[PDB]
Scaffold this active site. Sequence first.
Site, short mmCIF file in Angstrom:
data_model
loop_
_atom_site.label_atom_id
_atom_site.label_comp_id
_atom_site.label_asym_id
_atom_site.label_seq_id
_atom_site.Cartn_x
_atom_site.Cartn_y
_atom_site.Cartn_z
N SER A 106 30.74 45.09 35.56
CA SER A 106 31.83 44.95 34.58
C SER A 106 32.95 44.01 35.03
O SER A 106 33.84 43.73 34.23
CB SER A 106 32.44 46.32 34.26
OG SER A 106 32.79 46.99 35.45
N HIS A 107 32.95 43.54 36.28
CA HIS A 107 33.93 42.52 36.64
C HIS A 107 33.66 41.19 35.95
O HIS A 107 34.57 40.36 35.81
CB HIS A 107 33.93 42.28 38.16
CG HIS A 107 34.49 43.41 38.95
ND1 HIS A 107 33.79 44.57 39.19
CD2 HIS A 107 35.69 43.56 39.56
CE1 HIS A 107 34.54 45.39 39.91
NE2 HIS A 107 35.70 44.80 40.15
N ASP A 173 25.36 20.15 33.40
CA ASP A 173 25.47 19.82 34.81
C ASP A 173 24.40 18.78 35.14
O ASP A 173 23.20 19.08 35.11
CB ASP A 173 25.30 21.07 35.66
CG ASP A 173 25.37 20.80 37.16
OD1 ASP A 173 25.57 19.64 37.57
OD2 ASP A 173 25.25 21.78 37.93
N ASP A 183 20.87 23.58 32.51
CA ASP A 183 21.96 23.97 33.38
C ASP A 183 23.26 23.46 32.77
O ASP A 183 23.55 22.26 32.81
CB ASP A 183 21.74 23.40 34.78
CG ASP A 183 22.84 23.75 35.77
OD1 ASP A 183 23.86 24.38 35.40
OD2 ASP A 183 22.67 23.37 36.95
N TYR A 264 47.40 43.74 43.07
CA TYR A 264 46.88 44.40 41.87
C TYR A 264 47.92 44.18 40.78
O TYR A 264 48.97 44.82 40.78
CB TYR A 264 46.58 45.87 42.13
CG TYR A 264 45.37 46.03 43.03
CD1 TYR A 264 45.49 45.96 44.40
CD2 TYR A 264 44.10 46.16 42.49
CE1 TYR A 264 44.38 46.08 45.24
CE2 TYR A 264 42.97 46.27 43.32
CZ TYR A 264 43.13 46.24 44.68
OH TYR A 264 42.03 46.35 45.50
N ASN A 284 47.60 48.33 55.99
CA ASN A 284 48.07 49.44 56.80
C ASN A 284 47.48 50.74 56.26
O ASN A 284 47.69 51.08 55.10
CB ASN A 284 49.60 49.49 56.76
CG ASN A 284 50.17 50.51 57.70
OD1 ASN A 284 49.46 51.34 58.26
ND2 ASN A 284 51.49 50.47 57.87
N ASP A 287 50.46 54.40 56.70
CA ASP A 287 51.67 54.76 55.98
C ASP A 287 51.31 55.72 54.84
O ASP A 287 50.16 56.13 54.68
CB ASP A 287 52.42 53.52 55.48
CG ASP A 287 51.67 52.75 54.41
OD1 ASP A 287 50.55 53.15 54.02
OD2 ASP A 287 52.20 51.71 53.97
N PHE A 289 51.04 55.38 51.68
CA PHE A 289 50.40 54.87 50.47
C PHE A 289 48.90 54.74 50.69
O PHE A 289 48.45 53.91 51.48
CB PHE A 289 51.02 53.54 50.07
CG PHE A 289 52.50 53.63 49.83
CD1 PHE A 289 52.96 54.22 48.67
CD2 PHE A 289 53.40 53.19 50.77
CE1 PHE A 289 54.34 54.34 48.44
CE2 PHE A 289 54.78 53.31 50.55
CZ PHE A 289 55.24 53.88 49.38
N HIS A 345 49.46 58.22 45.92
CA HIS A 345 48.35 57.53 45.27
C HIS A 345 48.89 56.71 44.10
O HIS A 345 49.46 57.26 43.15
CB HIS A 345 47.30 58.55 44.80
CG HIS A 345 46.06 57.96 44.19
ND1 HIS A 345 46.04 57.44 42.92
CD2 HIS A 345 44.78 57.93 44.63
CE1 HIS A 345 44.81 57.05 42.62
NE2 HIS A 345 44.03 57.35 43.64
CA LIG Z 1 48.31 52.35 53.19
CA LIG Z 2 24.84 24.11 37.81
#
Ligand SMILES: [Ca+2]
Ligand SMILES: [Ca+2]
EC number: 4.2.2.-
Length: 481
Positions: A106-107, A173, A183, A264, A284, A287, A289, A345
């Site tokens: 789905s990306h 292409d 292509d 994000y 990190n 911490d 988060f 969160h």
């Molecule tokens: Ca963190």
């Molecule tokens: Ca191509």
Amino acid sequence: SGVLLESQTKITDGALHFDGKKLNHNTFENPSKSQAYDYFFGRNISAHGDAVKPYKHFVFMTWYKGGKEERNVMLSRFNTKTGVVKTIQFPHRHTGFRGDPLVGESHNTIGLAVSPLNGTIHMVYDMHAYVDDDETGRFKGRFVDDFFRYSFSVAGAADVPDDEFTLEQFVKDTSELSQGADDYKHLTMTGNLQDKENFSALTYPKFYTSDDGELLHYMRWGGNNNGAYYFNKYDAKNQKWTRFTPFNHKDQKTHGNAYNWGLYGQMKYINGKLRVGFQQRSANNDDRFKYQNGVYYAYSDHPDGLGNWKNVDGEDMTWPLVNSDEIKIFEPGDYIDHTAPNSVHIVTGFDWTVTENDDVHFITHVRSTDTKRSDYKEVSIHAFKPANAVDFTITTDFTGADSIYTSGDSIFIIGLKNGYPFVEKAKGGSNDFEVVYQQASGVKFDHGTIHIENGKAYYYLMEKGAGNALPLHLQVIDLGV
Ligand SMILES: [Ca+2]
Ligand SMILES: [Ca+2]
């Protein structure tokens, strides 16, 4: 309120949707070969991402052809004056998770733009941080010479008569890396294969049109706790794009920062400037988060974003950015009283906008990481600075949303409730939301994606239904501004 449904148009009966079972690290190499279409992240891939753009009296819309066995990239042009929808079927078919088409990914949206300066159409699609690699690589060599996927038309293609709106408007292409006579995918937007590394490992195509009619585009490199936004610009005269330039450095710990971080959020072109608003995910892990923290915002006084960046107070920003502290507005983690490592969160519910009056708005959401603790806390937050105010008003008297929009003097929350679009409206610089529109009958929708323009919301929607080939509809909603 003035908000009303101005039109609803069926665009196809069968766009792609993942109706199978969700797979994971343990199961993704053994997907179902039956009729249902398994997936790795979410179910949505059509009417999803930057897939709907008005242009003159047209609306252009991209989608994947439905049927688990089809999956072609599709481009439809809707003539709002005649009612005609004309569709172009491309040869490329969704290649799925890490290149296995049996696993829906789905990306991999189909981003879309049309140049108001020369009528060229631009599409970037089916991408999730792909690179050249070999059999032993994560992608098993499945994207060699094909890790950035760009198709575009000759000048004036957007305006041709319906009979002429065909795959023949698009440029093949013909480079040394061409994969054959069918292509249509270009590896760079600059027209120069020497730039291909500059186009490697990218996700999330998104286009904007500047106030002067110039197209802008940005994508994300990396992800998780080490990422960066990259943006470029269309040179209509030479019919090519510039190379990608970063908003922030990747690998920030090697560029002078204490930690790597991911982003994000979104870059947006608003009020004549390229701007960005996001929450960071620091690398990190000690911490409080667990995932994201903070709210961050900056804008550029350079027309193409090439420098002259500033934070909300007009202070100059290091560019490309290394230390997110420079542009931090506030800390949503402060609205929950946990302090132990990873106890806070922050993931869903973030978006931002700036109104035409220069009111600045952020929405976000914070909860306890441990949903089972007896002192569990969960809050949605609206932070806004009215045009002439010194400081932000920050309130938890807000129900939360996934997006926020603006047009005229108002901000909007637009989404689906029980399958029907609704609109909530408030004055810019305020927290006074009221539901002003709610569809109450007709076929219901599974998901959709929204583009705001001309004081209207273009709500590009997939109808609810069984299977992996479902109808798509375009609603045009006048926002009463
Ligand atoms: Ca963190
Ligand atoms: Ca191509």
